[PDB]
Every structure is written in structure tokens, then in C-alpha cells.
């Protein structure tokens, strides 16, 4: 996750991409205790809950949005940029992280790196990457040339100068999407051992109360815990 956050360049809002996170443990808590992000909003998710309970198919979306229009990119919120660039489902179970990128994403000369779709025929469906290179035509005003009848060109370069105000200054915002799916794999995120004492123990899925002593029984390398007649656990690895 840190590598995605520390990317040298961030994707434009029109060119926003989905990054699949799976087959690795994710430490959600590290993000909060870092507190290096200006803004952090968890919709339908609690930070403690995210650690204990996890959803498979985590998706990371990278795009640069001006701080003033950051509010538009929210679930249940409609904005010029949100309608034609990135759309969030209202019932979103995800956490969005935003931090100022003025130090590296802002250039005195200006950057043609970030572009937005000002004009689109229809509002985008949620999680739909925008792909409409052709200019407004509608067969009312069709030609390579610009009639000026609400035609122009949808993509316009963003301006991110140091002189620009903090709302104008670029902000790096990542959207994390959490969903529950049929596939078994899930991305979820440990005390010490007290022997010869009544303790509660929580071995990997096996819970109970008893005294733990070093044993002489040797398991096969694939066998986790042991049992006996009447099937009461009396050993553990």
C-alpha cells in the first residue's frame, strides 16, 4: 500500500485505474497511527472494525483532485468532476485517504499531467473509467472543427502552480473499495505463552481453558492439534 502511496506520479482523474489487492496481509492500522494524511473518511467502515473484520477484493483508485473539489468525490455526493470523471456508489463500504501533493505534484511552469472531463454526454455509472475521446457531436453539430455549440473538447489540463491557493493546490486521494465475495481468500490483519498455569488460550481457531505443558507426542508435519477418544482436544502445536 505504501508503494502505491509513494508513487512518483499519480493517475489523472480521467485515467483513474483500479489496483487489485489480494494474497497479502494488509495492516490498515498503520495508516491511522501514521497520521500523515490531511484528510481520512471511512464510509460504512470503523478503523478498529476494519482491522478485526476484512472484505476480499480490496481495490485502490489513484487520482489527483483539487482540495476544493475533493468534497465532490464522495459517495452520495454529485459534482461536475464526480459526474463526468469518477463516480462512487452511495452504499460505499470503503475508506478514502487524501493528503496534500503540493511538494511534488505542483510545478511553477504548470503540469499537463493531470486532465479532467468537463463535458460528457451522460453521468458515469459508479466505478466506470471514462473513455470518450470524441468531442461533443450528437449529430446536431458534427465535424472535426469546434462549432462552439457546447462542443469544445472534454479533456482540459489542470493548473497546479505553487502560487495557486491551497484549495487549487493538488491533493493525492486514494479510494479503497471493500466487498464480500464468494471467493474464500480474504485480506485480514499475538501475545506470549504461559505454561503450567490455568490460562485462556486462543490458538489458531482453537479456544479453551487449561494448563499447557511441553509434550512428548510428535505430530506429523501437517497436523495442527491432537485429540483422543471422545474427541476432546488434549494437544496443540
Amino acid at each position: 500500500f505504501g508503494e502505491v502511496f509513494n508513487a512518483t506520479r499519480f493517475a489523472s482523474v480521467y485515467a483513474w485505474n483500479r489496483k487489485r489487492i489480494s494474497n497479502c496481509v494488509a495492516d490498515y492500522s498503520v495508516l491511522y497511527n501514521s497520521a500523515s494524511f490531511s484528510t481520512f473518511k471511512c464510509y460504512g467502515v470503523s478503523p478498529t472494525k476494519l482491522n478485526d473484520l476484512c472484505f476480499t477484493n480490496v481495490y485502490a483508485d489513484s487520482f489527483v483532485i483539487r482540495g476544493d473539489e475533493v468534497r465532490q468525490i464522495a459517495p452520495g455526493q454529485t459534482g461536475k468532476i464526480a459526474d463526468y470523471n469518477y463516480k462512487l456508489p452511495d452504499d460505499f463500504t470503503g475508506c478514502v485517504i487524501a493528503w496534500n501533493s503540493n511538494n511534488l505534484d505542483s510545478k511553477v511552469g504548470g503540469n499537463y499531467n493531470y486532465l479532467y472531463r468537463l463535458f460528457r454526454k451522460s453521468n458515469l455509472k459508479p466505478f466506470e473509467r471514462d473513455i470518450s475521446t470524441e468531442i461533443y457531436q450528437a449529430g446536431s453539430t458534427p465535424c472535426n472543427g469546434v462549432e462552439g455549440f457546447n462542443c469544445y473538447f472534454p479533456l482540459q489540463s489542470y493548473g497546479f502552480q505553487p502560487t495557486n491557493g491551497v484549495g487549487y493546490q493538488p491533493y493525492r486521494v486514494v479510494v479503497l473499495s471493500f466487498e464480500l465475495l464468494h471467493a474464500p481468500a480474504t485480506v485480514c490483519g499475538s501475545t506470549n505463552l504461559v505454561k503450567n498455569k490455568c490460562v485462556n488460550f486462543n490458538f489458531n481457531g482453537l479456544t479453551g481453558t487449561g494448563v499447557l505443558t511441553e509434550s512428548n507426542k510428535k505430530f506429523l508435519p501437517f497436523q495442527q492439534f491432537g485429540r483422543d477418544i471422545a474427541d476432546t482436544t488434549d494437544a496443540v502445536r
Epitope: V4, A7, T8, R9, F10, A11, S12, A15, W16, N17, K19, S62, Y112, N113, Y114
Partner: antibody, heavy 123, light 110 residues
């Protein structure tokens, strides 16, 4: 073996637009950064555009800045260059470039080069 | 905008060492190693040298060269007929934030 298919290159009028499509096969498209390099015949190679794993735009040649748009889809394994305000200077042979380094900041070399397509801009 | 400088054309007899010089500003060549590309006329360019002296698989050991300071040198030994090609040195510039490509040198045998 990495194969870089080239298409969407044809004779075009100056005040028109043209899209170039590069097909990536034999390697993971998302893993390796993709770059655009053009070379007019009888002239030295000229870097035009760069993109990375996160699809963030590395930059554009100063001459093509504000007239050229670069975009890629990791799922489709394809990258598209949109050219506007085409000029006689723009006329060249655009070869797809595969870059080993995603950040392309340092020690970044082009492992494979596409055959290329010929954009001609004339009245 | 800094431009990588290369001699226009070089001609040498087979079996004669060939030296090609790439000239760049400190910000471009100094920060990252130059990459040499051997392009046969009418063919797509093929990488000849990666990270200066190191050679990618499929490049002859006779190809060599050392970059000192802001200058990158390509050394060709055991030159043969059909080795004629245009050589381009490419080094991205941190200051310009754009990749820089050399004008190129036209190696040939009579």
C-alpha cells in the same frame, strides 16, 4: 519475446486529430512502463510521451505538450496516444517503447521497440 | 533544453576499433547511465548497451565502451561487414524531466 503491434497511423489533414494504438503481448502490460518515441525519416529519434504502472503521465515533449494526450488500460494491455493540432513537424514514425523501470526516473532502458506506424500530416 | 551530441557519421575498416562519443549536460548523463541503441537502416531500434558497459543478452562481447564524467563512449572491436548501423545514446534528464535522445552516429563499412 515481447511484440508491440502498431496501428491507427495514416495520412491526415493538419487541423484534424488522430489516435495511435499499441498492442502489448509476451509480457505483463501493467508491470512494465510504456513510452512513445517518434523518428522522422533522415532525423534522430525523438521521445514523445511516457506513462507508468499507475497510468500517471510522466510527461510530454515540450513541442507536443498540450496537443498530445497519453492513456493506457492495464486490463486491455493496450496504450493509446491522442494527437491534436497535427503539423508537418509532427509527421514522423511512432514506435511503441517498452520500459523496464516503471518510475523511469533513472537507469530506465527500452527492452523492446515496436515496428511503428507512419503518421503523415499534409493538406 | 540540453541536446545529447553525437558525431554525424563514422567509417572504419573491418578489424579497426570504433569510438562513438555522446555529450550531455551534468543533470542528464551524470544522474543516470546512458543507454546505447543500435538501429539498422529501415528497422526498429534494438538496445545495444544497458546501464553503460553492461550488455543485454544477445549483444556481442566485442561491443564495449566506458562513460567518464558527462561523456559516454561506445567502443566496437572486431568490426565486421554488415555491422553498419545508426547508434543513438539515450539518457533521461532529471532537470528537464524528459527523456533525451542523441542525434545519432552513422557507422558504415565501404
Amino acid at each position: 519475446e515481447v511484440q508491440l503491434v502498431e496501428s491507427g497511423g495514416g495520412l491526415v489533414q493538419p487541423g484534424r486529430s488522430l489516435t495511435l494504438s499499441c498492442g502489448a503481448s509476451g509480457f505483463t502490460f501493467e508491470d512494465y512502463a510504456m513510452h512513445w518515441v517518434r523518428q522522422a525519416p533522415g532525423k534522430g529519434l525523438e521521445w514523445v510521451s511516457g506513462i507508468d504502472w499507475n497510468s500517471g503521465v510522466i510527461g510530454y515533449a515540450d513541442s507536443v505538450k498540450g496537443r498530445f494526450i497519453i492513456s493506457r488500460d492495464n486490463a486491455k494491455n493496450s496504450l493509446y496516444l491522442h494527437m491534436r493540432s497535427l503539423t508537418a513537424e509532427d509527421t514522423a514514425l511512432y514506435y511503441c517503447a517498452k520500459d523496464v523501470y516503471s518510475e523511469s526516473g533513472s537507469g530506465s532502458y527500452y527492452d523492446y521497440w515496436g515496428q511503428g506506424t507512419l503518421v503523415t500530416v499534409s493538406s | 533544453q540540453s541536446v545529447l551530441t553525437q558525431p554525424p557519421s563514422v567509417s572504419a575498416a573491418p578489424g579497426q576499433k570504433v569510438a562513438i562519443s555522446c555529450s550531455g549536460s551534468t543533470s542528464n548523463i551524470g544522474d543516470n547511465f546512458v543507454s546505447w541503441y543500435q538501429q539498422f537502416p529501415g528497422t526498429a531500434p534494438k538496445l545495444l548497451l544497458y546501464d553503460d558497459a553492461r550488455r543485454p543478452s544477445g549483444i556481442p562481447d566485442r561491443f564495449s565502451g566506458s562513460k567518464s564524467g558527462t561523456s559516454a563512449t561506445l567502443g566496437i572491436t572486431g568490426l565486421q561487414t554488415g555491422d553498419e548501423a545508426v547508434y543513438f545514446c539515450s539518457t533521461w534528464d532529471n532537470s528537464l524531466n524528459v527523456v533525451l535522445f542523441g542525434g545519432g552516429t552513422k557507422l558504415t563499412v565501404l
